[PDB]
Every structure is written in C-alpha cells, then in structure tokens.
C-alpha cells in the first residue's frame, strides 16, 4: 500500500520553488539531491538551488546546500565521484558542485560558447565504468556533448542531433538502457520519441516513433534485470494525458494509459520489480501500475495534501521508498508496501506472458477493426 | 580569416540542406500529384 514515510521542506530555500529533478546516489542510497527553479517572488535570492537531503537522520534541515547563479533545471549525483554534484542550469552551463569546498558557489562550470551548451539543459547523466566514464548532457536545441568529469572547459565528443532534412530535435528528457553506453533514447517536445546511438559509424538519431500528440515530459528505460531480458523496453510521459509503453523493435505504442483525466509528468520503471512503474499528475495523485496485476487501473494510488502539481518522481535503488516533488518544494517520501514492491521468482516469466498477451491483443485489436 | 572561413562553411551547410530538402520534398509532392491525378 501507499503510505507516507518522510516530509522534506526547507523554509529559507525551498519556498515558492518547483522541484525540477530528483536522484538518489548510487554509493549512498540515503542521499537525495533536489533541484529547484527560480523563485520570482525573491529576485535577490539565488535562482538555482540544489539541496541534498539525508534519509537516515531524523532532522528536517538539508544536509548540504548548494546554489548557482542561474536557475538549475537538472542535477544528478556523480556516479563514480562520491564528492561531486553535477547540475545543469537554465543558461546552459553545466555546474559541478563539491562538498569539501567551503563555498556553495559551484567550483567548476562550462563556458557558454558554441562549443558547449547554450540553450537550457534539461538532462544530464553519468554513464560508463569505474575506469572509463563520461558525463552526457543534451540541451533543448538538440546539442549533445560528452564531458569528462575533470575537463569541464571543453567537451571531448560533441555532435548535433538531427533526424530528417537536418531539423533540430528539441530534446526534453533522455534515458539510457542498463549496461548500455552507446545506444540510448530521447524524447522531443514536438511529440516524437527517438532512439539514438552515441558513437560509431552511425551517430545520432537511428529510429523514429510517432506516438504521442504532446511534448514528452519524461522517459525511462527498463531497469530490473532477471531471467528474461527486458533491456529493449521503455515508457514515456507526455502532456497529452497518456502514458505510452514502448519497445525498441515495434514502431508503435504497445499500450496507452488514458486513465488519468489530467496532465501527466513523469514515469520511471521500478529498479527491482520488472512490471512496475510510478506516474504522477497535475492534481497530485501518485499512481502505480503493476502490469502483471492489471493493465487498465492503477494498482495503488495516493494523493498529497493540498493537491499541488506533482513535477518529478524518483525511486530509490532498493525499490521500496519512492520520492516525489511538487510545485511548492514539499518533497514527500512515499514507502510502498512490500506486497507490491517485492516480486515473486516467476514474476519475470509472468511479465513475459503478460507482454505476449498484450502484444497479441493489441495486434488483434486493429485488424478486425479495419476488416 | 577564421571568421570568414567559418562563415563560408556555414553558408555551405545552408547550400546542401537546401538541395536535399528540395529534391526530397519535390519527389514527395510529385508522387502526391500523380496519385491525385489517377
């Protein structure tokens, strides 16, 4: 079941700000980084705020406070650097915070030149191994640059993403398959979901998916790995009141989730349960969809008090407590029940049978309608 | 020197995207024309 676990809110910083990104550290599963946008009511305060909360301690104050000159739109932890917080801002800078410094001002930032990002950056990620990794960032002009975590002055690999007739895909969010560095997916704001490859003979957008009728607000690949591989699976969120489930082979949406009667903002797969993901809306209702249980109603639903616009939702690496932000900075930590979170030993096979049945009924849905 | 060189290069990038867009969408409007003619 859905029950409250922890409430996070800071009076001095997170007042009248909207949560913009959420992430848990891979090395420290109790640490959650929280991006914030600009508060127009307080022009003299810093525009971008990047607070870090702690789950283990019972205190209400943020553990770490960082702020930037411009508004922070996307901020993640560094995967292989435990002391760093990487953020992307409204102006296109990629700020690199640090904890051992005595300043909340970022210790490293990218230049605002044509060799780096200039339009707003809404997604950053760290992919690679311990001995070899890079920072990947895509802005809203479609430019993608590969940074190293030290050389923050100029990128190593830079390329411009085009799909047809050299038009600019306006990328809003980006996902990566697990264990994959080269191939990945993106979601434009023109409604079109694309997959892509980073480096090789073919670099850029590979395929195309039409699907949605509104801008893609969030997209995540499948995360749980078991007996049956599901690395070719991803889901999308869009402004057109639907969550659509996809795969890298079929060029059509495998399913549509029109059950919400409002806007829909994020969705991301469970890292443990292979058939579970959570989505939010504009009225604060947090929904969970277990595909092995039912493919037409949310498996569990809760709403936060006051009904604000829930912007971002993030699962922990344990898959048990999930985090969600809103328009007031009122970060709520929701712990799901173990009856929904923990999967059975045959849950991968049950999900494979569910996917086969969904594919069969969807492929059978349109031929008898046409004929 | 380098500003002129960069500007010449970005004029060239305007001058083949024109050609690719032109013959692609001309072939598509021609197939549309013959399918509406029959």
């Amino acid at each position: 079941k859905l029950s409250l676990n922890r409430q996070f809110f800071d009076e001095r910083w997170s007042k009248h700000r909207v949560v913009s990104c959420l992430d848990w550290s891979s090395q420290y599963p109790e640490l959650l980084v929280a991006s914030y946008n600009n508060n127009e009511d307080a022009p003299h305060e810093p525009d971008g705020v990047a607070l870090v909360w702690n789950m283990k301690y019972k205190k209400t104050t943020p553990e770490y406070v960082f702020h930037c000159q411009s508004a922070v739109m996307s901020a993640t932890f560094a995967k292989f650097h435990p002391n760093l917080v990487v953020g992307g801002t409204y102006s296109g800078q990629i700020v690199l915070w640090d904890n051992r410094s005595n300043k909340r001002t970022p210790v490293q930032r990218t230049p605002l030149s044509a060799a780096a990002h200039t339009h707003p950056v809404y997604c950053v990620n760290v992919v690679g191994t311990q001995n070899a990794h890079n920072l990947i960032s895509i802005s809203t002009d479609g430019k993608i640059c590969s940074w190293s975590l030290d050389m923050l002055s100029h990128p190593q690999d830079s390329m411009e993403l085009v799909h047809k007739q050299s038009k600019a895909v306006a990328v809003t969010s980006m996902s990566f398959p697990v264990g994959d560095v080269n191939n990945f997916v993106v979601g434009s704001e023109e409604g079109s979901v694309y997959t892509a490859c980073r480096h090789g003979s073919k670099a850029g957008i590979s395929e195309m998916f039409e699907g949605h009728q509104g801008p893609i607000t969030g997209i995540h690949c499948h995360a749980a790995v078991g007996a049956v591989d599901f690395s070719h699976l991803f889901v999308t969120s869009s402004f057109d009141w639907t969550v659509k489930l996809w795969s890298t082979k079929n060029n059509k949406p495998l399913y549509s989730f029109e059950d919400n009667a409002g806007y829909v903002y994020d969705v991301m797969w469970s890292p443990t349960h292979p058939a579970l993901f959570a989505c939010v809306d504009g009225m604060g209702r947090l929904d969970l969809w277990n595909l092995n249980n039912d493919t037409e109603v949310p498996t569990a639903s809760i709403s936060v008090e006051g009904n604000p616009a829930l912007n971002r939702v993030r699962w922990t690496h344990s898959g048990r407590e999930i985090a969600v932000g809103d328009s007031e900075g009122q970060i709520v930590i929701y712990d799901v029940g173990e009856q929904i979170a923990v999967p059975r030993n045959d849950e991968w096979a049950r999900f494979g049978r569910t996917l086969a049945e969904i594919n069969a009924n969807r492929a059978d849905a349109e031929e008898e309608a046409a004929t | 020197l380098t500003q002129y060189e960069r500007e010449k290069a970005l004029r060239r990038q305007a001058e083949e995207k024109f050609i690719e867009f032109e013959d692609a969408l001309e072939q598509e409007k021609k197939e549309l024309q013959i399918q509406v003619e029959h």
């Binding site: 490293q108 001995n131 190293s148 030290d150 050389m151 923050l152 002055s153 | -």
Partner: protein
C-alpha cells in the same frame, strides 16, 4: 594498462614514480589510459603542491636574511648578482615543477580541476620572481 598498473608494486617512492610517469607520458593521449590512472594523480598533485608550498616558504625569507647570501659572499659573488642568481634558480625550480605537473596531468593540464589553481599560482609567483627592477636600480 595492466603493464602500467604495477606502478605501486614497482615504485616505492614518488621520485621513481615521477620518472616512470614521465617516461610513459605519450600513452595517456588515449582516453581509456587517462581514465585508468586516477588514484595516483591526486597523490602526485598533493606532493607537487607540498613542494610548491615548501619553495614558497623558501622564498618567505629574503636574500639578506638567507644563508645563501653568506655562502655567495664567501665564494666571491657580488650581492646584486647573487640576488639575481638566487631568484633565477628559484624560478627555474618553479618551471621544473610546472613541467612535472604538466607531465603528471598530461596535456590540457592548465584547464584541469587541480591544474587551474596550480597554473594560476605559478603565473602569479612568476610575476613576483622577475629580476628587471633590481637590475635597473643597480644600473641607475
């Protein structure tokens, strides 16, 4: 890479590790080799920073209070030329340490996380190590 990861099993002191890092410098243009060596670079930067601070404390005393002025005067060096010599050898050691950090961090070391402060402090120290004004005052 495995042929280069036996560095701690071979080098017991930072000077021979400096030497083998200088000898094998051209392999670090590859990004995988550059990413493979990260736990050595921090210690090497800290050792170079300690040497730079030690030379800063060497320059903390001045030439009249130094024992180098006495040892130059006992070896028939005039004091103006001895001061010029002393400042030039301090600058030469600074340039040698800048060469060392350029070797340790590879190319593009001036724009690095640790190389930025090192390069800025080296520039600001070399601004204070010039010997033109003392030569002009002696000439006057």
């Amino acid at each position: 890479t495995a042929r280069l990861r036996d560095q701690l099993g071979t080098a017991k002191n930072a000077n021979e590790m400096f030497r083998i890092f200088s000898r094998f410098n051209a392999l670090f243009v590859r990004p995988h080799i550059r990413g493979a060596i990260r736990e050595y670079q921090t210690q090497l930067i800290q050792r170079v920073k300690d040497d730079i601070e030690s030379l800063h404390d060497k320059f903390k005393v001045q030439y009249p209070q130094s024992q180098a002025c006495k040892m130059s005067h006992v070896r028939d060096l005039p004091p103006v030329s001895g001061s010029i010599i002393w400042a030039k050898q301090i600058d030469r050691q600074l340039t040698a340490y800048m060469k060392r950090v350029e070797d340790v961090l590879g190319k593009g070391w001036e724009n690095h996380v640790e190389g930025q402060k090192l390069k800025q402090d080296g520039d600001s120290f070399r601004m204070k190590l010039n010997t033109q004004e003392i030569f002009d005052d002696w000439a006057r």
